[PDB]
Ligand binder design. Structure first.
Ligand SMILES: Cc1ncc(C[n+]2csc(CCOP(=O)(O)OP(=O)(O)O)c2C)c(N)n1
Ligand SMILES: Cc1ncc(C[n+]2csc(CCOP(=O)(O)OP(=O)(O)O)c2C)c(N)n1
Ligand SMILES: [Mg+2]
Ligand SMILES: [Mg+2]
Lengths: 806, 412
């Protein structure tokens, strides 16, 4: 559960003290000095003479155009957290301002705790300076290695979705979400503005969006900064916000005059937020206007105004590095030396090199710190889900009526299971879906919870299962759902989210980024505890898009997921639910797991059930298993072909083809691969099937016919070094489809039962079976003409039931 | 190149001190006394008794209808330049108010430097008084012989064009351009109002037009003073200005009450100007509304109210000389003596005749002074043009095809 920390939502009821703002100004100066020492210096952190070009880095990498503004905001937020005792997580949208975050971690004392070799003295300062963006050092962005970070910020557009996710079901947590003005042009964040219509001020926390409007992107100005102030305020008010505006640094006003002004504006905003929270305890049915801060400052605000006669401060020329070579001229080194001395570090550091005590007296202590806040490290919060007994949801008719029974929909079983998980776990488990929960048949959870909706209600003929609080969030944006769930998991909670297969590509970037958060975490960051897994139910898949057609058919999610399987990280799982029982086993395993991205590919269509629960779990631990009840060959020597399958429709076609093969006396084996990554190379993947086990499943000399859900490229690229891999003949999706009957969909991809039987016959003896092969091939065309003439699939195809049903 | 002087475009961020306004009032009194001694006196500058008609000039020439208002503005501008360290050149549009300019040059110390024989004592004061508009003396207008002057002002209509010219390519220079209300009727200055559409606040300096609206020309009132205040503000706003208005001397308000009020109004205007300048460093593509000051005062503001039963102060009768003959009657000499004693010169000058030290403590020093500013003496700034080699542009076809060749255009 999310803990209550400090004294939440308290008003100051006093002026901001002068001593605190003294401390805030000194903090800002020292944070800018650290952020510059990191970029430029490799030695001599405190500029003991001789300070020469020997002390400067050979290759200057990093960013400065956002760092002083971030340091300003972070120092003021630190004063605020010390004063109010607020439970606060900062989300840094422009993550390229990494030196700001590392300077915070260093100054609040958490960096030395996490990394003991970076001491708080001259040698520790030298190591801290050298390690930024260095061989064998720390990254340039706001990284998982950086304490106090739940968001990398490298790939832009997801500060707001992550903020609204982090506050969900989390009522005491305050999140200032700093948003770059260039990042605000990206598609994800524009729609992430509208997510205050999906949170409740009573049951969820408060997100304060700080638009960091410094006017410029890389080498280009931002649209928001160059439209009129009337337009900007009108725009933010049309999205349910009260815009506040702060402008600074565009004239010669004294720094204290700026710190004081920001203190009054900040306390005004805090009082509006506290009023909203206090009102929500009585009335939470009508939405408030949350304050949001527009923070207009010059880009690179403390750097030299002009360098080489080019406007540097207040321009895009300060984005990455002013003084691109302070190492190769004497004039640029003098500019750099003057820039470092303009902060007066001589008074901010003591003799031994530690930041002076009066510079950090205004700082929060203990669990209130940014790097120490448990919501930033959501693995220490996390507790296991309390799971219902799986046998309660098993489809038992397979156990007595025989394999292949029924016309059930696989995802309804997961719906019931997830409903009871929600029942056992309220306020820790949440279901997201881009308008598609009821189309993936996960609506059984409406028996115990509602869709959280905080826009207007109009009627009850149209607004069923909607409520101002709920455990089902549903907005038509995959970016929103994925950012919500990722921030939900990163804070310590659990969740599933469902989607159409073809639109998972919309978040290929986001998944990639999350994998990079996991790949980095499992490799080099032990102090970050495991978080829950990102569970993605992929349904309404390529083979059954009757209503939509070719635009909704693209199973390429498997390929993008296969690219993140390296160095024994195991941060990826791709599971194929052949039926409801296998889906139960997969979902149980996935809900128990940690630090992974689990894509469970299950169909919503009426499909037969093949396994019992014990059989499903037994197939699960191996990933691939032989179906002894479907095989006609007792041992590996007898079979004239191995028929392997991965996916519900490929499984159905393999089984129907096996029925026809039985009538011709063909001895074959039947294999089902539930988990794709078990087929990976044994030396590469230590949790994949060993080579002996793989050869036992697939006969070394005998041909293997493989029917696969996605593109066959993904199977062939995975088994390349496996034994008997030359004989594998993968049949997968082949970018051929439309709106048409279900048999046609598999016909045009050469994955129907007739084509599979003909493929197996050709693997054995093309000459002996020539007449039967011809008969099958002309039957495919007759059965297509049947669907054209009559509008539905052939009775031979529709009515087929497996021979193993009693 | 135009130099950067002092600390340009700085806000005060404090109240104007009381001591500075004490100094400004004493400066205004002593400047009026000097401006009257120049017109009327030939001997006995400090009125040691016997002060008789022997001490008065035979031929009284000069102008007074604008001089006390100019002294007021110049003393306040001096306080401002001392406080802010501004690079400032004053353009005096009504140049017939020459005694104001010469009194400034004398009081800020530059006159003695330029002219060593005009010392700062009783004999020097006597010479300074006698030399104004005299055979073998200095002119009546604000002349090239007068330090701190780039504009003669004798022929009217070119204070504004000269101001906007002086600030061009000159980003740190502040120019208060004092414009007479009669001169504002002339054709040149009416179109010189519209020249804020040809200067850039970033690359050029700032001109502050001060309309010296005392209501009267020679023997006639001005059109601008007799139209409604709504019309005047609407007119100045249609030309890209923010009108500010100051009114003084039309009642019995205390002088300090006037100096304080002007201090507050002036600092408000300066803050708007400094905001414009700071904004121009970021955005210089959209034109601001520059402040301009409308300075409504009575013509000849410290002179006797009535002379010969005719309204003198606040009228056009004070344009050139009230008391056209203080030498030919005893009554007019008594009026003149009372006028000189109304400034209490007994406390503004010491025993030896120098202006007392506390009267000029609020004054700017060094290069910031009006008479010492290098932009007033533009010959010390000047450097030669770097000229391309002439032979590069010669028409060479004459050299080989013969004289009389071609159909070229000479000005290309
Ligand atoms: C989607 C995406 N496109 C491009 C980039 C490359 N990139 C990195 S930083 C940056 C500019 C930052 O813009 P803004 O949000 O205005 O930041 P700031 O002004 O704080 O530097 C860009 C385009 C990115 N990170 N993500
Ligand atoms: C073009 C032109 N016409 C006539 C004159 C004669 N002249 C000298 S002073 C003066 C009146 C001054 O008018 P105004 O600007 O109102 O001055 P103030 O009230 O300050 O005396 C005139 C008409 C002149 N100098 N220039
Ligand atoms: Mg920006
Ligand atoms: Mg006049």
């Amino acid at each position: 559960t999310s803990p209550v920390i400090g004294t939440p939502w308290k008003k100051l009821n006093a002026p901001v003290s002068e001593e605190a703002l003294e401390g805030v100004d000194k903090y800002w100066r020292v944070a800018n000095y650290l952020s510059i020492g990191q970029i430029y210096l490799r030695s001599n952190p405190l500029m003991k003479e001789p300070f020469t070009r020997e002390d400067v880095k050979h290759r200057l990498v990093g960013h400065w155009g956002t760092t002083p503004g971030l340091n300003f905001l972070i120092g003021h937020i630190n004063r605020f957290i010390a004063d109010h005792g607020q439970n606060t997580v900062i989300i840094m949208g422009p993550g390229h301002g990494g030196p700001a975050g590392t300077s915070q971690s260093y100054l609040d004392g958490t960096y030395t705790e996490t990394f003991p070799k970076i001491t708080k003295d001259e040698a520790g300062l030298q190591k801290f300076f050298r390690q930024f963006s260095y061989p064998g050092g720390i990254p340039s962005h706001f990284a998982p290695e950086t304490p106090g970070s739940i968001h990398e910020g490298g790939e832009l557009g997801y500060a707001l979705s992550h903020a609204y996710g982090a506050i969900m079901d989390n009522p005491s947590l305050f999140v200032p979400a700093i948003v770059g003005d260039g990042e605000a042009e990206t598609g994800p964040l524009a729609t992430g503005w509208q997510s205050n219509k999906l949170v409740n001020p009573r049951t969820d926390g408060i997100v304060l969006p700080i638009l960091h409007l410094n006017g410029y992107k890389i080498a280009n100005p931002t649209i928001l900064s160059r439209i009129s102030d009337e337009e900007l305020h009108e725009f933010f008010h049309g999205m349910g916000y009260e815009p506040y505006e702060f402008v600074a640094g565009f004239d010669d006003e004294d720094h204290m005059s700026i710190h004081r002004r920001f203190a009054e504006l900040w306390e005004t905003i805090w009082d509006e937020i506290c009023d909203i929270k206090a009102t929500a305890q009585t009335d939470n049915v009508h939405r408030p206007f949350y304050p949001m801060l527009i923070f207009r400052t010059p880009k690179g605000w403390t750097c030299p105004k002009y360098i080489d006669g080019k406007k540097t401060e207040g321009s895009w020329r300060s984005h990455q590095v002013p003084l691109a070579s302070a190492r190769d001229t004497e004039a640029h080194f003098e500019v750099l030396k003057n820039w470092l001395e303009s902060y007066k570090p001589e008074e901010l550091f003591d003799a031994n090199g530690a930041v002076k005590d009066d510079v950090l007296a205004f700082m929060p202590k203990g669990e209130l710190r940014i790097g120490a806040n448990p919501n930033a490290n959501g693995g220490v919060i996390r507790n296991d889900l309390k799971l219902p007994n799986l046998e309660d949801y098993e489809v038992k008719e397979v156990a007595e009526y025989g394999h292949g029974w029924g016309q059930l929909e696989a995802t309804r079983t997961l719906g019931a299971y997830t409903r009871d998980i929600i029942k056992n776990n309220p306020r820790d488990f949440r279901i997201f879906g881009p308008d598609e929960t009821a189309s993936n048949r996960l609506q059984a959870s409406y028996e115990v919870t509602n869709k959280q909706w905080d826009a207007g209600y109009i009627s009850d003929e149209v607004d069923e299962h909607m409520h101002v609080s709920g455990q089902v969030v549903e907005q038509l944006s995959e970016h929103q759902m994925e950012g919500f769930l990722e921030a939900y998991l990163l804070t310590g909670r659990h969740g599933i989210w469902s989607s159409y297969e073809s639109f998972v590509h919309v978040i290929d970037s986001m998944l990639n980024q999350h994998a990079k958060w996991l790949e980095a975490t499992v490799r080099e960051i032990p102090w970050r505890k495991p978080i829950a897994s990102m569970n993605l139910l992929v349904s309404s898949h390529v083979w059954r898009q009757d209503h939509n057609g070719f635009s909704h058919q693209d199973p390429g999610v498997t390929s993008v997921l296969l690219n993140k399987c390296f160095h024994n990280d195991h941060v990826i799982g791709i599971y194929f639910a052949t039926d409801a029982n296998m889906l139960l086993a997969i979902a149980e395993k996935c809900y128990k797991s940690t630090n992974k991205i689990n894509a469970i590919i299950a169909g919503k269509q009426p499909a037969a059930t093949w396994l019992t629960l014990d059989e499903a779990r037994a197939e699960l631990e191996k990933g691939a298993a032989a179906w002894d009840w479907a095989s006609t060959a007792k041992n590996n020597d007898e079979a004239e072909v191995v028929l392997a399958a991965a996916g519900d429709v490929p499984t159905q076609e393999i089984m129907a083809a096996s029925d026809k093969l039985k009538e011709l006396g063909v001895k074959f084996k039947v294999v089902n691969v539930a988990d794709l990554l078990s087929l990976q190379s044994a030396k590469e993947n230590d949790e994949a099937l060993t080579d002996e086990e793989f050869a036992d499943i697939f006969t070394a000399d005998k041909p293997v016919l493989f029917a696969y859900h996605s593109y066959a490229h993904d199977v062939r690229g995975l088994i390349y070094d496996r034994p008997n891999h030359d004989n594998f003949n993968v049949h997968g999706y082949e970018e051929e489809g439309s709106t048409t009957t279900p048999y046609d969909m598999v016909r045009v991809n050469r994955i129907d039962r007739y084509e599979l039987t003909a493929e197996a016959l050709r693997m054995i003896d093309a000459d002996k079976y020539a007449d039967k092969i011809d008969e099958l091939e002309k039957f495919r065309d007759e059965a297509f003409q049947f669907a054209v003439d009559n509008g539905y699939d052939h009775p031979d195809y529709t009515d087929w039931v497996y021979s193993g049903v009693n």
